[PDB]
Design an enzyme around this catalytic site. Structure first.
Site, PDB file in Angstrom:
ATOM      1  N   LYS B  10       6.024   2.150  11.445  1.00  0.00           N
ATOM      2  CA  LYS B  10       6.430   3.254  10.581  1.00  0.00           C
ATOM      3  C   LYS B  10       7.913   3.345  10.227  1.00  0.00           C
ATOM      4  O   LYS B  10       8.754   2.703  10.861  1.00  0.00           O
ATOM      5  CB  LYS B  10       5.935   4.568  11.198  1.00  0.00           C
ATOM      6  CG  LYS B  10       4.414   4.585  11.369  1.00  0.00           C
ATOM      7  CD  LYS B  10       3.901   5.900  11.937  1.00  0.00           C
ATOM      8  CE  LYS B  10       2.384   5.875  12.085  1.00  0.00           C
ATOM      9  NZ  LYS B  10       1.852   7.156  12.634  1.00  0.00           N
ATOM     10  N   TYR B  50      -4.850   7.768   5.082  1.00  0.00           N
ATOM     11  CA  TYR B  50      -5.084   8.986   5.853  1.00  0.00           C
ATOM     12  C   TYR B  50      -6.139   9.901   5.240  1.00  0.00           C
ATOM     13  O   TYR B  50      -6.079  11.120   5.410  1.00  0.00           O
ATOM     14  CB  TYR B  50      -3.776   9.767   6.005  1.00  0.00           C
ATOM     15  CG  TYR B  50      -2.775   9.123   6.938  1.00  0.00           C
ATOM     16  CD1 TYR B  50      -3.121   8.815   8.252  1.00  0.00           C
ATOM     17  CD2 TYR B  50      -1.475   8.851   6.518  1.00  0.00           C
ATOM     18  CE1 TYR B  50      -2.194   8.252   9.131  1.00  0.00           C
ATOM     19  CE2 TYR B  50      -0.538   8.287   7.390  1.00  0.00           C
ATOM     20  CZ  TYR B  50      -0.906   7.993   8.694  1.00  0.00           C
ATOM     21  OH  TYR B  50       0.010   7.446   9.564  1.00  0.00           O
ATOM     22  N   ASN B 116       5.835   8.893  15.297  1.00  0.00           N
ATOM     23  CA  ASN B 116       5.428   8.193  16.503  1.00  0.00           C
ATOM     24  C   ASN B 116       5.501   6.672  16.493  1.00  0.00           C
ATOM     25  O   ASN B 116       4.622   5.996  17.027  1.00  0.00           O
ATOM     26  CB  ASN B 116       4.032   8.654  16.931  1.00  0.00           C
ATOM     27  CG  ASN B 116       2.987   8.436  15.861  1.00  0.00           C
ATOM     28  OD1 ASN B 116       3.273   7.891  14.796  1.00  0.00           O
ATOM     29  ND2 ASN B 116       1.761   8.862  16.143  1.00  0.00           N
ATOM     30  N   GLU B 130      -8.966  -0.201   7.128  1.00  0.00           N
ATOM     31  CA  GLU B 130      -7.515  -0.240   6.983  1.00  0.00           C
ATOM     32  C   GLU B 130      -6.984  -1.626   6.622  1.00  0.00           C
ATOM     33  O   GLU B 130      -6.098  -1.758   5.782  1.00  0.00           O
ATOM     34  CB  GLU B 130      -6.861   0.271   8.273  1.00  0.00           C
ATOM     35  CG  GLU B 130      -6.955   1.788   8.430  1.00  0.00           C
ATOM     36  CD  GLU B 130      -6.662   2.276   9.838  1.00  0.00           C
ATOM     37  OE1 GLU B 130      -6.063   1.520  10.632  1.00  0.00           O
ATOM     38  OE2 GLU B 130      -7.027   3.431  10.147  1.00  0.00           O
TER      39      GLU B 130
END
Lengths: 153, 152
Positions: B10, B50, B116, B130
């Site tokens: 991320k 998401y 995170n 995904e």
């Protein structure tokens, strides 16, 4: 003074599981990764990258080496990045590379080719050519690394 | 058996220069990177990733967070890779993550979203969805890692 240079984490490094360690050295130096991807270079693309060596006897073995397994091509951006990355890479033949450099710490053994962990553009001109060969403009990004604000000149 | 799972390093990890550190943890574990690339996720792609949270109050913050800067998406292959990578990632909220895990060692601070460090597929089903969302078959490879022969 900011420049972009191309690095290729070669098959020997990928097979040996050294991708992460190599990337970390560039990140801790302060260099920014503006593009990166794992690809499997075919002979045609490999020969274009190494076009300057086409007429040399070691050419075939070099192409065999760079196309042996997938590699990770990435573009690094930073102050005098071209010469700085070459310095971080170390001597062409790992046996001659100084401890502390990428080749000095991770390379030694060779095949028919002088396996040397990574490729680093040898000049700004070569970097521009190489980056254009492996990346499309939409695959290169401009974004902030955490400490960029600190150096606002 | 051998499985493939999706990991996203991320924006917080990219900005903080933790890409290499994270990748090394997977490599030393014995996991194989069969696909990887730095991309800057657009809002529509992020919302597809998401999709399960589309009707929730924290959805927008999630989208803002994952599209803040480029990220590194990668596919890891190995024995029970899905559960193994989830274990290596640690608790969802880094403050609760155990020392030794990726989130436990590198994450803590949060924004409007619970930053995170990485994303790890939660199941084999999610992993397949995904992986297809971010990679084309031509971007995934089958090749030998150094010690593959040892486990024959």
């Amino acid at each position: 003074e900011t420049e972009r240079t191309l690095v290729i984490i070669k098959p020997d490094a990928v097979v040996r599981g050294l991708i992460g360690e190599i990337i970390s050295r560039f990140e801790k130096k302060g260099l920014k990764i503006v593009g990166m991807k794992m690809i499997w270079i075919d002979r045609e693309l490999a020969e274009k990258h190494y076009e300057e060596h086409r007429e040399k006897p070691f050419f075939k073995a070099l192409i065999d080496y760079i196309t042996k397994t997938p590699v990770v091509v990435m573009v690094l951006e930073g102050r005098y990045a071209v010469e700085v990355v070459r310095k971080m890479a170390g001597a062409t033949d790992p046996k001659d590379a100084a401890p502390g450099t990428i080749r000095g710490d991770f390379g030694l053994e060779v095949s028919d080719a002088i396996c040397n962990v990574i490729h680093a553009s040898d000049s700004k001109e070569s970097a521009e050519r190489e980056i254009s060969l492996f990346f499309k403009p939409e695959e290169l990004f401009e974004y902030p690394r955490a400490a960029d604000w600190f150096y606002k000149k």
